[PDB]
Design an enzyme around this catalytic site. Structure first.
Site, PDB file in Angstrom:
ATOM      1  CE1 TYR A   1      13.857 -24.719  15.804  1.00  0.00           C
ATOM      2  CE2 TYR A   1      15.139 -22.944  16.725  1.00  0.00           C
ATOM      3  CZ  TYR A   1      14.058 -23.375  16.001  1.00  0.00           C
ATOM      4  OH  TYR A   1      13.144 -22.493  15.458  1.00  0.00           O
TER       5      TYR A   1
ATOM      6  CB  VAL B   1      10.150 -17.344   5.335  1.00  0.00           C
ATOM      7  CG1 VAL B   1      10.912 -18.148   4.291  1.00  0.00           C
ATOM      8  CG2 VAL B   1       9.075 -16.492   4.684  1.00  0.00           C
TER       9      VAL B   1
ATOM     10  CG  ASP C   1      14.216 -17.423  -2.534  1.00  0.00           C
ATOM     11  OD1 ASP C   1      13.827 -18.498  -2.004  1.00  0.00           O
ATOM     12  OD2 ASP C   1      15.326 -16.885  -2.288  1.00  0.00           O
ATOM     13  CB  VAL C   2      12.586 -14.098   1.741  1.00  0.00           C
ATOM     14  CG1 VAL C   2      11.112 -13.791   1.768  1.00  0.00           C
ATOM     15  CG2 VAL C   2      12.823 -15.545   2.102  1.00  0.00           C
TER      16      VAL C   2
ATOM     17  CB  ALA D   1      18.818 -23.267   8.949  1.00  0.00           C
TER      18      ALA D   1
ATOM     19  CE  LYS E   1      12.350 -19.315  13.488  1.00  0.00           C
ATOM     20  NZ  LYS E   1      11.363 -18.501  12.713  1.00  0.00           N
TER      21      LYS E   1
END
Lengths: 246, 245, 248, 243
Positions: free
Chosen positions: B158, B93, B65-66, B96, B165
């Site tokens: 978003y 990956v 899990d990053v 949010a 991003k």
């Protein structure tokens, strides 16, 4: 001035050499009632000093550590007791643990440095817009913040701070996106640098560094109704550097 | 094919019809030996089974899990028993906290939601560039990641994933300045979506792209065919990004 | 190869080591059968000879000065005599008269020199786009062109030609928008400098610490006109090893 | 006003509803001595009237087709017989042959349309900088031109002007880095439309006014923007920033 009648909060005056300090100065010349925040008691004295010569007063200075939500909300409760409303918030906070900002980017950048740099420098600005939404109700004001070219392109040792700046400028656009229906304009001013600081000078089109003043003037305008069709802008005050390659 | 000889780690395969599964496919089509990580224990069986059909084995599947440096490090230390080097890391990956991606931005965005979004969806990339630096030494490899138009112009709900991003996308540029010397390239692929019919009519190609199409590009980017390209964000969106109205 | 079964016209082959040739070589190597234009009567022999090492023949070469609309269609009138349809156009011609590209911009930049720089470097793209629209119909093909960083940021002695590429790059988007409906993809590759003193700094800066090669700029260019890149239109693919992303 | 002291040549004034007009009003308001051009013999007197309403007079109005080299020449010559120095040149003339702005980009665009589109909408700037270099020299002046989103992205029936405009914007950049050393600054306003569905998406949920574009236009040519050069400043409510 062209900013007469407006009333602005000013975050992160830490010095007079600051970039914050050029903006406050030009914003008083143009007729604005100002307020200030200081991160901690250390800097409380010199903020109040500067404040008093900037048309403001010790009682318009409040303690704020933008890493804290409540303290930001506390700033907007107390200030809101001297002014019936706020028009402008200015944001000049740049902080990342230095070990993130000198060495090979990939190498030195830790998760925690990433967490912090972003929190202090990116989201603080959303929280400020958040924690003051009410006080900017029906004032048709505006929000401002500071960015750097390192969010759009890379440079030595700026490192993970370019990731924070890139997010801020995004945050700026999304702030413009939402806050605008109630009439708030969100913009940011990206300034140039203030041996190799001279290699900058002779590629910058104007053959010279910009002054903390010119950024003040330019950041003043963006907060005045002279700049009232202008939202989501990132304005580059860097003598034109970004427009160069070789 | 144009990837034979290259080994590729793929982080974040979670469904059969995700952009990441499109990448994973093409790179196999093109001969890459593939290895995979899985986000948690539920998805494990799902990831192993996909891996097996993309020429790999469950042996080449590892827990990650990053959000945790330590597990990440165990990935390359576990793989390093299987491979004496690695060419590619593919980073798909993107996440949010849900409530931040439903509503007015200023209203719904939280400190902790911000911190998470940016952690998982951005810093995790740099953690993978780091943790995998050694295995990638002297192979002239590449790292691919996924971004989206939200980083550059706004659009509904978003929200904070548009800051994430943009931070990612800057990290592409920075990881590139850094790892380039050694010969690693770093690139991103910003895909289109997959009434969203508004999008389509506006999009120059009048349709959406497919995970297939996003994967060929994904692949190309990580293949020697690309070896002159680095620090770049390739838009697989039929042109939609280039239209104002 | 992955261009197998595709037909392309290639405009601008003038040297054996141009970006034009890097593309033509790449594109052949992956199966596309090719056609070529020669700029004038001096390059005919060169261009034809090259064309034969690229599976093409003398017959598949055509004369065309991209300043001439009438010659531009003479290509396609004559080409459609060997080919019932076309799949790709590669547009690779950079030319502003030399006096424009030397010294201080504002001083040495003249109205005619400006006119030429834009008519050759930029409009011609739109014109190959036009002239060959009929032959490209139904093929879900693509146009590809070549740009430079100069168009987006300044660099000494590029002068007016950066003006003519920004125009071009904009042109790419408008074509991509116009022609997407009927299937035509339109993209660009924007190479960094190529090898043979001022260039050594360019490579200390660029992330890969080396300039790119026409074999790199050609693969990119090849890929971009292959169904592999069928989800990509309106794009400006940078091939400079990451230069465009660095500032100091 | 912050342009007090400044003198300014304005190219492009042709209508009451001009963008050109919005800058002149906001610029004159800010205390500049203006001076104007008129393309043909028609519109001559109409420029003059506006000019005499802007603190100027019909003697600071000169004939100019930005297509003809010699006129622009003759503009600054004559102007330098009323004026010591020049501080600002403003460039607000957009023109592509109408047919080009009506229909399929590929189909309607012709070479001749291209040429005129670029010569008028983009070379004119360079020529104005060029032919009026000497009068600006010494002055730490500034130039300003007008552009539009069609350079940065596509939209219906703009076609070739997006190409002209794109070129112009590089032209901003190349100028700025050429005339920077001697003090000349160079910028542009990318002004939105002054469209109904446009409005829905722009952040301020409204379109911009010629007083809003004119202010910023004035600001940029004033010493309050002396730390700015090579910019494409967007007055459109944040529309550019939206998808």
């Amino acid at each position: 001035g062209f900013l007469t009648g407006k009333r602005a909060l000013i975050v992160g005056v830490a010095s007079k050499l600051s970039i914050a300090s050029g903006i406050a100065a030009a914003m008083h010349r143009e007729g604005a009632e100002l307020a200030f925040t200081y991160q901690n008691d250390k800097l409380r004295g010199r903020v109040e000093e500067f404040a008093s010569g900037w048309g403001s007063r010790p009682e318009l200075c409040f303690p704020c550590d933008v890493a804290d939500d409540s303290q930001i909300e506390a700033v907007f409760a107390a200030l809101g007791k001297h002014w019936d409303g706020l028009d402008i918030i200015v944001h000049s906070v740049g902080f990342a643990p230095g070990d993130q900002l000198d060495g090979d980017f990939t190498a030195v950048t830790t998760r925690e440095g990433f967490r912090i740099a972003h929190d202090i420098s990116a989201y603080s600005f959303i929280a400020l817009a958040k924690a003051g939404r009410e006080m900017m109700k029906g004032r048709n004001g505006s929000l401002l913040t500071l960015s750097y070219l390192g969010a759009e392109r890379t440079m030595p040792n700026y490192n993970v701070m370019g990731m924070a700046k890139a997010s801020l400028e995004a945050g700026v656009r999304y702030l413009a996106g939402s806050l605008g229906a109630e009439g708030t304009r969100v913009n940011a001013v990206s300034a140039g640098p203030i041996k190799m600081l001279a290699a900058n000078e002779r590629q910058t089109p104007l053959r010279r560094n910009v002054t903390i003043e010119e950024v003040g003037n330019a950041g003043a305008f963006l907060c005045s109704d002279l700049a009232s069709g202008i939202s989501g802008e990132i304005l580059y005050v860097d003598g034109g550097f970004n427009t160069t390659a070789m």
